[PDB]
Design a protein around this ligand. Structure first.
Ligand SMILES: [Mg+2]
Length: 925
């Protein structure tokens, strides 16, 4: 019934009606010592409904993430279960359908992540031993599990040891790997007529090509260099390989296996050409030809987009090498290239126009960059940039030749051939932009072309056109302004606000969106208002203009990010409008809570909200709080993990701002002590901010500190969460009354030092140091001495001498240095018993005071900048780059005044010759 029980909840969770009930009943079930295995056996049962297994598979993936390992890499599951799961999972994933196999690939990737190499010795043996010659389907399996683990090298950067883990793997897979590839190649030539058999064979080749990459993404192992001719040989072969059996001319949008094998094969070649050009040298030309004849026989069909890309990434990698460039360097291979490769793949194809009308925002993501860089205009552009950096004048000219024609052709019948104006607006642009088009715009441009002129002559006209050939053009025009803003006159730009703001009142999805985007950029510049009031109102209007449905509503993230940035410009200009705005923002939140889609959107909505509150006046903060609380409480009652991080931050902000905790927020305090809430990896920064506020604003809300120090203990023990530890403690000790802390102080002291003795981190030690300077100034040196001396007798002497003195001058962060330094100085010159009880330490702490003084010569997604608390408490009067040294000097002088020429003279001889000299410099300075 363990299995039957899970089976039941998975099934119930699939019923929209019993999802919250199910999810909760599943969480409860999660606590059991076998839940993981149960879930797996379920997924593994063939007789169950895909829907249920998928649900099970899916849940498993998420379970793993939150339960498999804590912050610090520790298995939160019992050894037995853990070892069992890793044994079960590999064979399970090797047998599942792609849909579920993929879900498990992620589970397994996460598992491999913290345990792959050390805590999973059998993995490589087990995988290798499952490769055979007759069982291809099974091979693909084993191979997939493989690639999903090694995948994770590609983004990494070289390391003294990465090579070691790779060697660890390579040694095991090298032979059978090449052996299977040889086998696969032979088997393919023999099955030339078995659709079913080919397909399968090519499903194995695909993963081999992908693993081949995995093994060569850091270096070329001796085994692949010495044995390259065989590999590239095979790939050189399937790149040209064709087969009726692996075609489907009726297919227009979805790539085949044959095509995928050719795309990912083109991705290897590009890796070799970029990373081992000489070791690869020979073969580069053989490839340049096939890639060319391949690019010339492809249709403008979606089905090939990725292959056209990946193959252009290879040509572009080639053009970088002077030797090969010379073959495009003649004046006709430029002309050919244009006519053969670029012009065809860059022309607006019919299927695009359909997208521009049928899925406007998808079109919008393909014309703008950030994600989904797979395409043809991008590969082409990146290629063209490589060509024009070699012979600016060569390329620029032949293209100019072609465009001049595309212009005349447009002139003849604007209505019939506008696609030509799109075409050169593209080309000119692609030839004009000189570098990597940053957010800042465009760092430079091709001199042989004049962006402004081209603009006044052909980009502007299209913005005012009575009737236009086609909308896409006005869009292209806006995109032009957007792209070249840096190159246009600031007045030239402002002259465009009026007309741009016109498009925000158009039903043309793309236009006003682009419109928005461009006004946002333009206003941000005029920065370093009645206009804005009107603008927000129009921008918000456009956010509802498509309906209130959760999925569709959160669709346009560009509009919401723009609203945010308009608010980011008009700080406190529009205080009277906030409430209505806030009320609408919350209104969007409420709708979205129903089905949180598009995280980007979710984010900017909170940032906007975040902003409004940041600029509202404290006295008028309340009304705002009463309009969001009801909406937020419901966020909690139904744990909407997509919004919680944001709400915490905001409410946290709200509290830090009030002089008292608003009664509609007080009930949050206690439930916020529940350990459950502190076991959610990505919400910690945000929650310790909330706890932190309640404490600052009103400690009385926590009648029993015990559970609080409960959290402190949880954090301060976690290498991963030390920073959160201290942050919380600063508040605890400097903001709660002593007579109310007097009984936990011994405990704090002990935990603070247990992490010192048996678990330190460079980060930790300095933080301790600053924390000590922090207490020395605030609670007093005597306080501090008594503080650590509680743990054991004499400990102050040992810790001050070996950890604080020595670290002080190591501290790099300026603010943390100031605090620590003034904190330490503060013990020499304001310490009642230090100077007399600890003789040893005076010269020592003195030395470092003088050295240090002289020195001068994934939770981020849910991090609201708008409210970001980037200004951490500090002693204001001192300047982190000037003043700290004068303070010391001054503080010291004012201290000899009390004993008149006594102190400084007694020390000097005990200071180091170096410091003695530094002290003279310092005093006089
Ligand atoms: Mg004392």
């Amino acid at each position: 019934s363990d299995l039957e029980t899970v089976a039941k909840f998975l099934a119930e969770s699939v019923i929209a009606s019993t999802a919250k009930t199910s999810e909760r009943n599943l969480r409860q079930l999660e606590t059991q010592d076998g839940f993981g295995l149960t879930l797996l056996h379920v997924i593994a049962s063939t007789n169950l409904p895909l829907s249920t297994r998928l649900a099970g598979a899916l849940f498993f993936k998420n379970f793993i993430k939150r339960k498999w390992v804590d912050e610090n890499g520790n298995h939160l599951l019992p050894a037995n279960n853990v070892e069992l799961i890793k044994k079960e999972i590999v064979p399970l994933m090797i047998s599942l359908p792609n849909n579920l196999q993929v879900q498990i690939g992620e589970a397994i990737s996460s598992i491999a992540d913290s345990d792959f190499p050390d805590r999973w010795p059998t993995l490589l043996s087990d995988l290798a031993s499952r490769l055979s010659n007759d069982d291809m389907v099974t091979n693909k399996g084993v191979l997939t599990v493989a690639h999903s683990i090694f995948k994770r090298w590609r983004p990494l950067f070289r390391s003294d040891e990465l090579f070691l883990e790779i060697k660890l793997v390579l040694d095991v897979f090298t032979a059978p790997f090449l052996n299977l590839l040889k086998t696969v190649d032979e088997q393919i030539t023999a099955n030339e007529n078995n659709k079913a058999s080919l397909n399968i064979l090519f499903d194995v080749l695909l993963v081999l090509i992908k693993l081949y990459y995995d093994f060569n993404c850091q270096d070329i192992p001796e085994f692949f260099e010495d044995n390259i001719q065989v590999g590239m040989g095979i790939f050189h072969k399937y790149l040209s390989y064709s087969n009726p059996l692996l075609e489907d001319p009726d297919e227009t949008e979805h790539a085949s296996v044959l095509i995928k094998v050719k795309s990912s094969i083109q991705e290897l070649v590009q890796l070799y050409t970029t990373r081992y050009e000489d070791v690869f040298g020979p073969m580069i030309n053989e490839f340049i030809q096939i890639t060319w004849n391949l690019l010339t026989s492809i249709s403008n069909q979606p089905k090939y987009d990725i292959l056209v890309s990946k193959s252009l990434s290879f040509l572009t990698a080639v053009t970088r090498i002077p030797k090969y460039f010379e073959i495009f360097n003649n004046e006709s291979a430029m002309n050919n290239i244009t006519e053969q490769i670029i012009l065809p793949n860059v022309t607006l194809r019919e299927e695009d126009v359909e997208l521009f009308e049928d899925d406007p925002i998808e079109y919008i993501r393909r014309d703008l960059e950030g994600s989904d860089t797979d395409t043809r205009r991008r590969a082409c552009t990146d290629f063209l940039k490589e060509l024009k950096e070699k012979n600016e004048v060569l390329v620029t000219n032949i293209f100019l030749a072609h465009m001049k024609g595309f212009v005349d052709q447009y002139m003849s019948d604007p209505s019939k051939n506008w696609k030509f104006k799109d075409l050169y607006i593209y080309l000119f642009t692609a030839l004009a932009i000189n570098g990597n088009i940053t957010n800042a715009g465009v760092s430079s441009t091709n001199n042989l072309l004049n962006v402004v002129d081209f603009f006044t002559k052909e980009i502007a006209p299209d913005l005012t056109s009575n009737n236009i050939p086609h909308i896409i053009l006005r869009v292209d025009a806006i995109k032009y302004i957007y792209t070249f803003r840096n190159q246009l006159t600031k007045a030239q730009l402002i002259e465009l606000m009026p007309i741009l703001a016109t498009f925000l009142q158009t039903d043309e999805y793309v236009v006003y969106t682009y419109a928005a985007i461009t006004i946002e950029k333009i206003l941000t510049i005029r920065e370093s208002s009645n206009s804005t009031e009107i603008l927000l109102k129009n921008l918000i209007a456009l956010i509802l203009k498509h309906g209130s449905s959760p999925e569709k509503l959160a669709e346009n993230e560009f509009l919401m990010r723009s609203i945010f940035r308009v608010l980011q410009t008009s700080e406190d200009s529009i205080q009277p409008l906030f409430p209505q705005l806030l009320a609408q923002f919350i209104e969007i939140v409420t709708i979205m809570a129903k089905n949180p889609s598009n995280p980007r959107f979710t984010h900017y909505t909170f940032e906007s909200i975040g902003a409004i509150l940041n600029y509202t006046q404290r006295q008028n903060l309340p009304l705002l709080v009463d309009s969001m609380m009801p909406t937020f409480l419901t966020v909690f009652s139904e744990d909407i993990q997509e919004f919680i991080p944001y709400v915490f931050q905001i409410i946290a902000f709200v509290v830090e701002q009030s002089a008292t905790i608003p009664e509609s927020i007080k009930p949050l305090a206690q439930p916020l002590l529940a350990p459950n809430v502190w076991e959610l990896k990505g919400n910690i920064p945000a929650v310790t901010r909330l706890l932190k506020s309640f404490i600052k604003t009103d400690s009385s809300i926590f009648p029993d500190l015990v559970p609080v120090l409960g959290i402190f203990q949880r954090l301060i023990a976690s290498k991963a969460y030390e920073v959160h530890g201290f942050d919380l403690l600063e508040h605890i000790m400097l903001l709660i009354d002593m007579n109310r802390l007097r009984p936990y102080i011994k405990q704090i002291a002990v935990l603070l030092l247990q992490r010192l003795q048996n678990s330190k981190t460079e980060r930790y030690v300095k933080k301790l140091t600053v924390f000590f300077g922090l207490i020395s100034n605030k609670l007093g040196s005597d306080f501090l001495i008594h503080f650590i001396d509680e743990v054991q007798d004499g400990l102050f002497q040992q810790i001050w001498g070996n950890f604080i003195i020595t670290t002080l001058p190591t501290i790099g962060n300026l603010l943390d240095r100031k605090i620590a330094l003034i904190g330490v100085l503060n013990m020499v010159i304001n310490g009642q018993f230090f100077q007399s009880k600890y003789p040893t330490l005076i010269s020592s702490t003195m030395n470092s005071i003088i050295e240090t003084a002289s020195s001068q010569s994934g939770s981020h997604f849910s991090k609201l900048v708008s409210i970001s608390e980037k200004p951490f408490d500090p002693l204001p009067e001192i300047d982190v780059n000037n003043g700290v040294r004068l303070y010391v000097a001054e503080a010291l002088n004012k201290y000899n005044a009390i004993s008149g020429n006594t102190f400084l003279n007694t020390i000097l001889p005990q200071l180091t010759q170096e410091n003695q000299v530094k002290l003279n410099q310092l005093l006089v300075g």
